[PDB]
Write a protein that binds this ligand. Structure first.
Ligand SMILES: *[C@@H]1O[C@H](CO)[C@@H](O)[C@H](O)[C@H]1NC(C)=O
Ligand SMILES: *[C@@H]1O[C@H](CO)[C@@H](O)[C@H](O)[C@H]1NC(C)=O
Ligand SMILES: [Ca+2]
Lengths: 49, 100
């Protein structure tokens, strides 16, 4: 259920993104981009288990 | 006046917004007389002059045309930074070496 929780967390992070045309990006998209390593680490740890 | 038109040519203004911004800057320049001094700056994570002018120049027909051409030749790209742009604006309005 913790793996489930991180899956819904990642889905909400993905749904929270916004896209601007020519390389512009929102002030909150940086935070969403920094939150990725936690998700990839949890997925790798689960795969290792 | 002593204008300084900060145009926000960042990524998020591509398409219709940039068209309206360049038309609006042209129509804003068309309300400046020969007693008025104006420059046009543009910022996207870095603020720069849009034209060959480095300071506030008189708003006569020739200078207004140069600024209009520079604004018409402008493109949108990059992340916004409202601090490096207003710093440029407030610095160019603190120049007293030039005629004003
Ligand atoms: C001005 O126009 C010329 C010709 O279209 C272009 O090569 C140049 O990059 C333009 N200036 C700027 C600052 O983009
Ligand atoms: C104006 O002139 C002074 C001395 O000539 C110089 O130090 C300064 O950098 C010039 N420019 C501005 C914007 O003050
Ligand atoms: Ca922007």
């Amino acid at each position: 259920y913790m793996i489930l929780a991180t899956i819904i967390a990642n889905c909400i992070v993905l749904a929270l993104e916004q896209h601007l045309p020519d390389g512009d990006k929102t002030p909150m998209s940086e935070r969403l981009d920094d939150t990725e390593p936690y998700f990839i680490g949890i997925f790798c740890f689960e795969a290792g288990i | 006046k002593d204008m300084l038109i900060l145009v926000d040519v960042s990524g998020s203004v591509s398409g219709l917004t940039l068209k309206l911004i360049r038309t609006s800057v042209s129509e804003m320049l068309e309300t400046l007389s020969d007693d008025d001094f104006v420059n046009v700056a543009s910022f996207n994570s870095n603020a720069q002059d849009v034209s060959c002018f480095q300071h506030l120049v008189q708003a006569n027909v020739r200078n207004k045309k140069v600024l209009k051409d520079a604004v018409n030749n402008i493109t949108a790209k990059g992340i916004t930074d409202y601090k490096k742009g207003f710093s440029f604006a407030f610095e160019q309005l603190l120049n007293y070496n030039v005629s004003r």
